[PDB]
Amino acid sequence: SRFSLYPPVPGQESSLQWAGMKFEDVPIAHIKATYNNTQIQVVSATNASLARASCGTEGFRNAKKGTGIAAQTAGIAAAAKATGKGVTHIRVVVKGMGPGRWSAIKGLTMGGLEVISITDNTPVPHXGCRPRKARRL
Amino acid sequence: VESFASMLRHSPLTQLGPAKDKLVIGRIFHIVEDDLYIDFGGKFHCVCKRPDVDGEKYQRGTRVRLRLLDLELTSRFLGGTTDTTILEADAVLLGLQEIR
Amino acid sequence: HFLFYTGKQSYYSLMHDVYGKVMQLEKHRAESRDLIGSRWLIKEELEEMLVEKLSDEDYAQFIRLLEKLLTLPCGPAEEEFVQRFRRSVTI
Amino acid sequence: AGSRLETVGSVFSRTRDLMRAGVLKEKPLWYDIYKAFPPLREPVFRRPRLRYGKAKADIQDIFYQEDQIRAKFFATYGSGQKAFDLFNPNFKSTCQRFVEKYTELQNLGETDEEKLFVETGKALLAEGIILRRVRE
Amino acid sequence: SNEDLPVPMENPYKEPLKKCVLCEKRVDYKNVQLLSQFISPFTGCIYGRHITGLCGKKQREITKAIKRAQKMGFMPVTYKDPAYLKDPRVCNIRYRE
Amino acid sequence: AKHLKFIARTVMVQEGNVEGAYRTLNRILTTDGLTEVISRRRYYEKPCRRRQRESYETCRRIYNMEMARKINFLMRKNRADPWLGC
RNA sequence: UUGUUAGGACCUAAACUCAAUAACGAAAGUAAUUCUAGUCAUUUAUAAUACACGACAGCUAAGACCCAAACUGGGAUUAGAUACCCCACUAUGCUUAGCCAUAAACCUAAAUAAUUAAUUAACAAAACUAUUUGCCAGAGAACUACUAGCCAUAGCUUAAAACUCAAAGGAC
Ligand code: FES
Ligand SMILES: [K+]
Ligand SMILES: [Mg+2]
Ligand SMILES: [Mg+2]
Ligand SMILES: [Mg+2]
Ligand SMILES: [Mg+2]
Ligand SMILES: [Mg+2]
Ligand SMILES: [Mg+2]
Ligand SMILES: [Mg+2]
Q: How many angstroms separate the CA of residue F51 from the nearest CA in chain C?
């Protein structure tokens, strides 16, 4: 009789629907937030591309391409393309820990899309590849 | 004349055993605002807060009931050579004792 | 005087009296504005009464103790006492 | 002129020395009193030091034979619901009455601790004391 | 000499030593229901002994069983199994809102 | 990669509060230490550097937790003066 | 090129959390999982011209190669920038054989058995006794010259003097 933060377990049967679709059917908004450019892609649950955007494609350049307001504009642009294709609910898998990590999610909301969940897929190696050397400053 | 060794063996404090979670009778001797200083027969007094219920009843000389925890609050800290003491006892005020 | 070796025998003799008065009132047990338009004597005035020199911390402590006396039930003896340390204010 | 050296000797020895030297011409008034009724220990300075290695203090833990019985009573029944009054010099607690009866039975010659503990509970029950065997 | 002098003995009132919630119990890699009580629901990361509250010996036993179960095909690595989400909470950690 | 998608590190939005859900997801990742781990994996920390940092952070946590105990312990005596005037 | 893949291949390289732990080993070093082999009794200290080891870098031959990266090239900065910052890419870090034998190889604490009081140069890591070996004798010249040994050849270990100075050095 309460809300569950935990996503509906896959393979089972749940009582939660969004526009007549189950959790496994809602399209996914893949946000890659890096320290320079924030890219956004929306796909259907069958992995078919519907919208794409990024600070670069919007027209920002160099250090402006990696700001919060630049990602917000990129999110609004991705929403508009997806909204035309017929998307109202999105599952936000946000990879990356850059400046437009949250702003890209805020732009998608401003653009008329309804986020039902937020996942994080930032790559965390379990022991992997040696990172580049520390910068001296 | 009774010896000191006998006096200690038959002392109420020796009978109490460990003072953790024991019940004792105290007497209020000093009040500062809503803080009650209660003597329960030990070396150090305890300091409790005036209960909301029957607050006016807790006046000086009033005997109360307590649940002891420590007779002296002390603790050695990292790098210390001696235990730091606050010269106070620990008890939980339960309420007035029935005069009966 | 028994408080000679304190170095402030007159300041501490007065703080002895007011602390003993406070104890008897607290043990033994109305509006406290018996006097209005009055101020506490300034440090320079207190020093003259005691015929000795005080610090700012010594003056502040004397007032806090006198305020506590007024808070408690006060017989006419206490009111006359605190009166000696009150100077009439002229508006 | 004096001996303000409080880390060598004692007040009495330093006063004895100053008079022998010739600097202190009159005995202090407390001198003859100390000479006739000295303290048990000489008041000489000593620097406190920590113990190291396997050196230990010499303090006996005070444990009477009644404590073996008292420990069982607190574990089985806790502290008596009646509150301790530590202001009455002759107070008899519920636990102290248990230990007095437990001793009486043991004087008769009972050798089993289990026998003495369950019999004592019965005797106090006859007396009317309310003993609650609180496992909680 | 004196009958009332104290008697040397071990402390009658000595309090018992506190045990961990897995004291004198068998930690098995196949018991994934118990192992899941010491990992994170979201990331599946093993909790430290400051959160779990276990002793050193059991902290190592749980750690070895989790790694063995994960590597042998009994326990998931990246998350806690959703079946075991309802089990009792034994760890001093709060995540909700 | 071989696990199931949308179970790990996933939070559900309640009543369209997309900011509240994002704030919860961050506390989960910060609490599990993923945020610090990802921060330090951008560049390489040398093994000697890693050991020096961990030994210092451990000793800083001991002295901090111990200082908290000493303040909390000595703050019990912090109350209105009972012997005002003496 | 980029993003996604609940697609395939790969098994190269490295082992998050646990680890706020302080274990194992002579030291070096060692923490993904499993199995096999395996550490153990000399009273104790005390060893080289002998034996066996010894991070990283480096050399030799055949492989590996995800990522990192001396050098090198390209781009910036600057009076210059043979650098710090950016990008690319080697030797190299990996495996298998052998060599090399050096580290601030530093707990800057030789080992062992006692003691905690009849004991503050300073700081660090409280003081101090006994036993055995090693080592030291102002600073620089000098991790140098010469000698001998060594798979080492721009190498390692061993290791002076002339000459110069009246200080050098440690703690506060
Ligand atoms: S306290 Fe006994 S095994 Fe943990
Ligand atoms: K070192
Ligand atoms: Mg260049
Ligand atoms: Mg290469
Ligand atoms: Mg060497
Ligand atoms: Mg080393
Ligand atoms: Mg060299
Ligand atoms: Mg040479
Ligand atoms: Mg040579």
A: 52
Which residues on B lie below 8 Å from F63 (Cβ)? 78
The residue with tokens 């937030």 is A33
Measure the CA dihedral C33/C37/C41/C42, to 10°.
130
* CA–CA dist D29, D10 (Å, integer): 17
Technique behind the model: cryo-EM
In order of C76, D135, E76, the CA distances from E73 in angstroms are: 90, 45, 8
Instruction: Considering all nucleic acid strands, name the nucleotide whose C1' atom is nearest to the C-alpha of residue E60.
Output: G18
User: Ligand 1 within 6 A of E58 CB?
Assistant: yes
DSSP assignment, residue B20? T
The single residue listed with the structure tokens 């806790």 is D78
CB B50 within 8 A of CB B59: no
Residue nearest to nucleotide G32 (CA to C1'): E67
Contacts of C9 by beta carbon, 8 Å cutoff, 6+ apart: C1, C3, C52
- Picking from F3, F9, F10, the nearest residue to E77 by CB comes out as F3
The resolution in angstroms reads: 3.1
The response to whether residue E59 sits with its C-beta less than 6 Å from ligand 1 reads no
Note whether E11 contacts B: Cβ–Cβ < 8 A.
Answer: no
F51 CA → ligand 5 middle, Å? 25
- E13, D61: Cβ pair inside 8 Å? no
CA distance B9 to B2: 11
Angle CA F8–F14–F20, to nearest 5: 80
Q: Check CB contact of B67 with chain D, cutoff 8 Å.
A: no
Q: D28, D15 in Cβ contact below 8 A?
A: yes
Task: Give the nucleotide with minimal C1' distance to the Cα of F57.
Answer: G20
Cβ within 8 Å of residue F77, ≥6 positions away = B86, B88
Amino acid F44 reads Y
Neighbours of E4 (CB within 10 A): 14
Task: Write out the two tokens for B72.
Answer: 């002296």
Tell how strand A49-54 and strand A38-43 pair up.
antiparallel
